[PDB]
Every structure is written in structure tokens, then in C-alpha cells.
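User: We ran a pulldown and think these components assemble together. Before we commit to crystallization trials, I'd like a predicted model of the whole complex to look at. Sequences follow.
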Amino acid sequence: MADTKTAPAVTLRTRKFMTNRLLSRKQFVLEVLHPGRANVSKADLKEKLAKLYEVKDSNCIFVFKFRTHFGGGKSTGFGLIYDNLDAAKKYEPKYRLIRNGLATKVEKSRKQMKERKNRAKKIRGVKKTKAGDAGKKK
Amino acid sequence: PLILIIRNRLKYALTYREVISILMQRHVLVDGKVRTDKTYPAGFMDVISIPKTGENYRLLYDTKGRFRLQSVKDEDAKFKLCKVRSVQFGQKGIPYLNTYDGRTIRYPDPIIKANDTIKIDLETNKIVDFIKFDVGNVVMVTGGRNTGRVGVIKNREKHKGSFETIHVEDALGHQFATRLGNVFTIGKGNKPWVSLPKGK
Amino acid sequence: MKFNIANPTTGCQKKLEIDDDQKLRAFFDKRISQEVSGDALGEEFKGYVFKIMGGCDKQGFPMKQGVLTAGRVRLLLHRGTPCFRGYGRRDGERRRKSVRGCIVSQDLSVINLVIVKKGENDLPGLTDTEKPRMRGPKRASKIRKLFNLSKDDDVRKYVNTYRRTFTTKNGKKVKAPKIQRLVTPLTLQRKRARI
Amino acid sequence: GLGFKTPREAIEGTYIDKKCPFTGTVSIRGRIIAGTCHSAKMNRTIIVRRNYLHFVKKYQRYEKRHSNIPAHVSPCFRVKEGDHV
RNA sequence: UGAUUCAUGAUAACUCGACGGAUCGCACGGCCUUCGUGCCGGCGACGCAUCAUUCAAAUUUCUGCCCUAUCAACUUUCGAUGGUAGGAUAGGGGCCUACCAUGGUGGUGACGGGUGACGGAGAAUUAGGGUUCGAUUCCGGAGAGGGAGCCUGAGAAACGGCUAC
RNA sequence: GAAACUGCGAAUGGCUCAUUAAAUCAGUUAUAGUUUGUUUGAUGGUACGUGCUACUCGGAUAACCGUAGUAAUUCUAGAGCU
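Assistant: Here's a predicted model for the assembly, 618 residues in total across the polymer chains.
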């Protein structure tokens, strides 16, 4: 598996694989042995990997949901290889996309967003004249 | 219901809520027609089959009696076995022959009763055959603990107020009797479809 | 007091002031929709006919037709009713609010007058200035009334938003929109499909 | 259209003076009680229609339910039994 | 169809009359009789009427709930109880209301009072049997400051709707 | 594409368990005592005129543009549009 240095391989293993022609992609489990070593990395995975299944891009493919167990030397996550960049986005939830680089996470303020819609309903006419009206009126 | 059934195929990880994209691109069809409704009523013997590069499925029962996929032939997918759930009877030849999913099919066979079953195709809704409910026929029990068992009808008992029980000889164990609503006949001497081990 | 006066012929509005008790009391105790001689109201307003359209009092509470009374009364309002706009937050919502009578009194901050017939002499802010139509008839049959094209001619070439105008968005000036109810093969195919 | 049945025997039918057509009919029952295991008996009287008529007191008839004609009238006089002599 | 005679259908009618798409939207097509925007018609979008239906509801039958008689008779004011009739509402229905009769119900504990008395699936703890508990991400109902009344809509006696006190 | 109009939801969900002791409710029926948008699938020669003259398309409001009133209100008057 998994290319070596001196610091051991950290196995690149796949398992429980179905190619599903609805989602139009490859779903599988990545069970990464890490004998005597820490974390494989999100990069190191999608840099090997790529060239086995011959998707040959890191960009479209995502790996996630590492959790683990006690005792060390293994970690379990899940990763997918997608048939196209365009196709992938539609099927994928947004949380995958944002970290992958395909999307930006927009931050919002609750108070600003909801109140503003109500204001638009209330004014009818240009209503510029009302500002001048109030000045005169006191 | 559709959402559960689709998810059974998908379940490796992280789909589920994203079922919606599949549905709206019409890469799921149920009985050759578009439905995107999770709340859709389903029963035994629904056919699922999706466009072009697809597969064909028959709804079957697990140990609980919940819907699960089995692969079925493309030839069999063209046909469907439908319980006549309720009936509008007789004159001038205008039956509404209700089914579990809610399909209507119209106009006399030289028979027609409640609890009898009608063999239908899929798309056009024309009558392939009509299957009489009678003794010696093969049955699936749709509900209760006993679900996922098949057996042959020993006798039907008829009484006042309702016909209370219909008895089935066979079972993994021994004989049991059920209500008419629980009984869905799935095979007859005239036409069976039954060549399946089942459930529990 | 203040008057906000409309002349609908131009479609313009401006506010003008009438001060003098004798001039003002001509308005008093009259109902909404009644016409008022112009000359009493002022010398400059000669020949004019003014119909009392409404107005608001101090505290801003508007007149409502037919209710009577020189004072204010509290009445139920519904959605899509005068003295009520911007709608209820929910559908079917009703509100009890103070609302003013139709009968003119000294408590009024402003009276709204609409000019029924133009007078002898011009009024500088109202009649002298003029406003062109914002939009013109979108529908095909309505175009035939105004423009008198006739049914064979086909609307689109002649028209646009209030006659044929060329205008700029940002940096491009150059077309017609799609007039509908206008007979097209799009309507004809589905109409044929009825039979 | 008709109802679920209970059998009962008439406790009544001849209670004070002049009576509007109907009878009171007792059901006695026993049911297994937790703890003691000995059944506890609970009375109940219900007011029956005699649409059929021909009903004398202390007479067993069989009751089949129909829709409630005022309130507490659930059962009706379906059929009888009759006695000897 | 167990049980509707309803349904289906016949005949005479009712109606300040319901529906059958004028912008019947959108993207495309044949075939030529005057080779003509001639004359045709597919597919599904949204909407339309009536019916079965599904997602549903609401009434209703049988049976079942703690404690107390220092609570033994209860009810019929103004339906209590049943009959007859009507109007109402989706519908039977004292539902209310006229007329009519004088009933109904109780020691098998009714009627009355009390109760952090929601009910249930369930929980705790008990060998078991039981005892005690049930505010709780569920299930069904009630209420949404207290009360009454009502609009809209398939549906609310709504309360982050109204209307009144 | 912003908005405005129309459509639909807001009756749902969530919360609490005061009241409430055959009552809610549970199991269980009944609905031949009923309703049901949505869902599912069927279903329209009709339409009028002595069944050859008789009927094939009407306007009017918001956005808007402008002018105004109230201390203020899911506040709202008014004109010219469409």
C-alpha cells in the first residue's frame, strides 16, 4: 500500500465499496492503519489514492468523518471519488464542499437578515418624502 | 414509503437528506412514474425501476415486516400484482378498483370482489389477469408478528357481521389464521408469481 | 391650514396654503365627495371645482367615507379596506383603530382636494407643470383603444412603455417587449389542443 | 346498520307507575383483579329500546347496538328467547 | 352489499346556477388544397369540474381509572328522561327549540366533594405476587395572561390572528 | 435579478400539564350518521340559437413615478399610470 519513507507506510486501504449509478459515484470506507505513527493527513490520502482509481485529481474528491477508537494504530473515516466536478456538487452536502475548496461558507447575522425583510413590506411608495415630512412635522 | 426504501440501497454513508437531488433529477422512478413524495403510500409488490441504466426491484419483507429491496427481472417489472383494496360495485360497468398505493383501474372482469386480487401491468393500467380469492391459493400475511411467511389456504370461515378469520395451513411452525385485510393472495393455481423463500 | 391638492389632468401634486377664516369655513361641515366652489377658497383659485377626497387630522387619523361625525370613532378595519394598508401580518386579520369622520372640522391638519374641473387662471405648482404617464397599456386590446392601430397591424412595433421610447440602462442606448393576449402560435397550439 | 352485542337480563321494566316504552337491563361481570386474584363484581344498568315491542319485565332478550337515539340508549331489542308454558 | 331500496337508472322539476384555460403558459413538429403563420396534432407545466382514493379528522359502541358515605339517593330552574317534529351543522344526535309523555339512575357505591388527578405506552423498586409513579425530545387531548365571540381557509372556536370586556 | 401583486403556509411545530376523575385517553368498534385541500388514478360531443345567425374578450389596483398628512403605529390620504 501507501508509499514509505523511513517513517512507516501508514496503509492506504479501501473497503465496503459500492458504485451506485444514482448518486453516480464511488462510495467506500478508508480504514487507515497508522502503525507507530500519527495522522495520515487530508492531503497525503488524496495524493496517493487518486492514481489508483485514476480520477487523478485531489480537487474533486473528499475524505472525512475520522473519529477513531482507543489503542491507536488505526483510524476509520470515509471517502468518495466522484465521476465529474459538476456532478459531484449537486449530490454532495455543503459541508464537504466548503472544506474541499469548492465552496465558501457564508456567515450571517440572524437579527440583520430577518428584520430587513419586514421593513421592505412596510414601505409603499418612494417614501423619501416621509423623511422630509417628519423634519417639518417635528 | 419511498424515502426509507431508497435509503436502504444508498446506505454506506452520507446521503439521506441528499436523496432530494436524485428525486428532482428524476433518476428515481417508481412504477415507471415520477413521485418525489416521501409520504407516498406503499405496500407489498411495488415495483421500483429507474431510467435507462437501471435495475428492477420488488418490495419484500424482512423479519419485522418492513419493506426491503430484492432484485427482480425486467420481464417481471412490466407486471405488478395489486390487491383490490376496495371496490365500487357493478352496474353500467364503472368499478373504482382501489389498490394499496391508490391506483384506480376501471371496468368489469367476469367476476370482481373485495379481497380478490387483480393482475395489472405497470404503465398503462390494463388488466393482464384477474385472480380469484379461494381455497388452495398462496398467501402472504402483511402484518403482525407472522409477516414474511407464506402458506396455502386451508379454509375460509364466514360468519355474521364480518367474515372473521381465514385459515392458512402452512407456516414455519404450524397453522395460523388471520383477518381478510391481513391476507393478500399472491398466487393461485391459474397464475402464481411465487418462487421465493421469505422473511423469517 | 395645509392643503395637498391634486390636479389629475397633469397627474401632478403639490401643497398650497389657504389662511383666512372666511376662506377656510367654506370647507367646514361638508362631507367627503361633495364639490366645493373655488372662488370662496381663494381669489387665485377662480373657476376651479374641488372635490373633497379626504385628508387627515392631527394624530394623522384619516377620513373614512360614509361614517359621518365631526369627531373620531373607533371602527373595525379589514385587509384590503381604506384606512388600512401594508397588510396584516396574517391573512384575515382585523384591527380596531381610531379613524376620523368624513365631516370637515377645524381639527384637520390637511384636507386632500382633487380638482374636478380646471379654472380660468393657472396655479403655478399644480397646473403649469405637467407629468407624462409612467407606463402605458401592456395588453394588446388596451393598446388598440389608445393608439387606434386596429387588429391587423400588430401592437409591438408601434408601442413600448408609454409609446415608443429608447432609454439607457447603464451606458447602452438602443426593441419591444412581449405583449401578451396578443395572438401567437404559442396560444394557438394549446387552444387547438382543447378540441 | 347494526352494532356489537351484549347479552343481558331485565332488572327492571316495571319501575314506578306508568313508564314510557323501554326497560332497564343489568349486566353483572367479573374480571381478574391484581393482588387478590378474586374477581370484583360491578353492576351496570342500561336503557334499551323496545322498537319490536312485546316486552314484559324480568325477561331475557338479546341486545344488538344501534346509533344513540338520545344519549344512553346504545342497545335495541333484536331478538328474544321467550320462556315456557 | 351480511344488513342502503342509496348507488346505477327512469321520469317530471329546482336553481337571482357550478364547470368546461381568451395572457392554453413554456420549448419544439409535420403536411401542403389557394404552397398559404393554409389546415393539423404530440409531450408535461400550472390551473379547472365531478368520482373513487390517499394523507387525514371528528363524532360514536363495548370495557377499563386514585381517595372519601363525618357524601344515600340523584335529576327535571331554562331537556332531566323517551317519543314526535323541525332548524342547524359535514352528519345521526336534547343539539337546541316547539308539542307530547313522565320518566332516567342508584349499595354491583350512583349523585356529591377532594386530588402536582393529564391519560397512555412506559418508569422506580419488589425473587415472585405486588406496591408506587407517570412534568418531560414519543402517542392522543387541552390551554397558551383570564374569559367570550369571530374572519379567512381543506381545516383554527387560532392566540408569535382579530374583535370586545 | 431586486421589489411589488396573486398563490400557499403560518391550523403545522415547539412548550406546558393548571384545569381535567367515564373525562381526557387506552384497547376496541361504528361511520348503513360524515367530511376531507394535498397524494394517487380515472372522468367532460353537452356550453346554444328555431340545434343556419348567435355569442369571441371587459376594466381597474398594487409595483412605479410623483405629491402629501400624523408625535408615532402591521399608520396611511391622493393623483397619473398599468
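The first strand of chain C starts at residue 2 and ends at 7. That may be worth checking against your pulldown data before setting up trials.

User: Thanks, that helps.
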